[PDB]
Amino acid sequence: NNRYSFIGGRTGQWQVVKIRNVLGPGLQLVEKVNILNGAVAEIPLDSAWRLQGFASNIRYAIRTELEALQAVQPMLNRAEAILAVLIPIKKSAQWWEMAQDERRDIFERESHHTAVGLEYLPGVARRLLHCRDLGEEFDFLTWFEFAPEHSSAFNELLLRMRASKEWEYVEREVEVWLKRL
Amino acid sequence: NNRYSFIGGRTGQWQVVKIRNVLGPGLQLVEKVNILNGAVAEIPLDSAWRLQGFASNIRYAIRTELEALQAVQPMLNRAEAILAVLIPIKKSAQWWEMAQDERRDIFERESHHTAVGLEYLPGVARRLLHCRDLGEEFDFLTWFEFAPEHSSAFNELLLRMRASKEWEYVEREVEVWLKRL
Numbered sequence: 166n167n168r169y170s171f172i173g174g175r176t177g178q179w180q181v182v183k184i185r186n187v188l189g190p191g192l193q194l195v196e197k198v199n200i201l202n203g204a205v206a207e208i209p210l211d212s213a214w215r216l217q218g219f220a221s222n223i224r225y226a227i228r229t230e231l232e233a234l235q236a237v238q239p240m241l242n243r244a245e246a247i248l249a250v251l252i253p254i255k256k257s258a259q260w261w262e263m264a265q266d267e268r269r270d271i272f273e274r275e276s277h278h279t280a281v282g283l284e285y286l287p288g289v290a291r292r293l294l295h296c297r298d299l300g301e302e303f304d305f306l307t308w309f310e311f312a313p314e315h316s317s318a319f320n321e322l323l324l325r326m327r328a329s330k331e332w333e334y335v336e337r338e339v340e341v342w343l344k345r346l
Numbered sequence: 347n348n349r350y351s352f353i354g355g356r357t358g359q360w361q362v363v364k365i366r367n368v369l370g371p372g373l374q375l376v377e378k379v380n381i382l383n384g385a386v387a388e389i390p391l392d393s394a395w396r397l398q399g400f401a402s403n404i405r406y407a408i409r410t411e412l413e414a415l416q417a418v419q420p421m422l423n424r425a426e427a428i429l430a431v432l433i434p435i436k437k438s439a440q441w442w443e444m445a446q447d448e449r450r451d452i453f454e455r456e457s458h459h460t461a462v463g464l465e466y467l468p469g470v471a472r473r474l475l476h477c478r479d480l481g482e483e484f485d486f487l488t489w490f491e492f493a494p495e496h497s498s499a500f501n502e503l504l505l506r507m508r509a510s511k512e513w514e515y516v517e518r519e520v521e522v523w524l525k526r527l
């Protein structure tokens with residue numbers, strides 16, 4: 166199954182450390198996030214919100230970028246990676262109406278998204294889900310996990326991304342910080 | 347709503363003229379196709395099959411290409427567009443694991459998908475839907491409609507595309523030919 170659901174409420178494998186409502190309307194604070202590998206129609210009891218999205222194909226990265234990523238990126242579920250951060254993102258209509266070269270140019274040529282992210286590997290593990298195509302309020306669910314040592318670096322990475330040309334098209338962002346139970 | 351469903355069975359706005367099972371397991375012949383703008387979980391009565399997909403953002407076309415398409419491409423549901431073809435396509439794992447430059451190159455540089463297709467506009471209208479990401483048996487639903495004067499031409503277009511490098515990656519294809527009621 167390529168579909169993943171994230172349920173904020175009173176149960177789950179993760180503990181909410183904090184939520185930062187960076188841009189746009191925020192998400193309600195909850196005790197825990199429950200993550201599932203399937204669609205969930207039945208909104209669980211004592212749960213404030215459901216996010217969902219699917220794993221998909223590459224949309225921007227070229228072969229050499231892929232090769233570079235594969236050489237250093239860590240797997241998920243390292244025993245040390247006890248911290249995680251869920252970051253929903255929505256981009257603007259002006260971004261989506263742009264052609265594929267335009268988007269590619271802003272993504273790597275101007276914002277160096279891959280080159281910058283590579284500096285934070287192997288400390289940081291990541292998963293990218295898509296959800297615009299499902300009719301969700303956000304376009305993307307981004308997932309990061311790392312050991313505490315790397316929390317500082319990760320905060321540094323967030324502030325760099327937010328300074329890029331790419332982030333000018335971002336109209337909604339929340340940080341959910343998590344600790345594995 | 348970005349989601350479209352296509353049900354084969356005994357009702358619909360379109361009459362099945364024929365079904366050609368081009369490559370891989372085919373679709374059961376039926377009398378009619380019902381086309382809905384939404385999901386359909388409730389498998390309709392006396393129906394053989396259901397295909398669905400969503401309209402999505404551009405994945406390959408560059409801005410100059412988009413400009414050429416917009417100059418000529420017809421709208422859907424012209425009075426004279428009484429013939430249609432629905433063509434589900436599945437591409438191979440090997441296609442899907444390739445990077446974004448690699449697919450772009452096979453699609454346009456080697457296959458000239460857009461340059462070739464542009465020779466058949468404005469006679470042919472088209473819609474493109476995606477459904478790998480929903481876990482369908484097909485990766486894509488393609489939709490083409492035109493006046494009969496253009497049928498021969500449309501047939502030439504199919505044979506050109508299928509001789510392309512792109513089409514070596516296609517592992518399942520069915521043409522459903524229709525007539526408007």
Ligand code: HEM
Binds near residue numbers: 254
């Ligand atoms: C930590 C290292 C990171 C690496 C190595 C990295 C790498 C990548 C790569 C290669 C893609 C393109 C995937 C594709 O072609 O389909 C991507 C997409 C994305 N990344 Fe990152 N990323 C990192 C961190 C982050 C962070 C911190 C954020 C946001 C807070 C972020 C947000 C995104 C978004 C939204 C996309 C999808 C872009 C779109 O389709 O418009 N990334 N990431």
Ligand code: HEM
Binds near residue numbers: 407435459490
């Ligand atoms: C009639 C003129 C045609 C034109 C102008 C045309 C144009 C295009 C364009 C520009 C794209 C790229 C969309 C994007 O970047 O998101 C595309 C995708 C596609 N076209 Fe065509 N097309 C035509 C006919 C056909 C026919 C007859 C078929 C199949 C029988 C076909 C199958 C496809 C498929 C499967 C894709 C998606 C490829 C992918 O995302 O991997 N096209 N078409």
Ligand SMILES: [Cl-]
Binds near residue numbers: 291292293
């Ligand atoms: Cl990923």
Ligand SMILES: [Cl-]
Binds near residue numbers: 472473
């Ligand atoms: Cl289209």
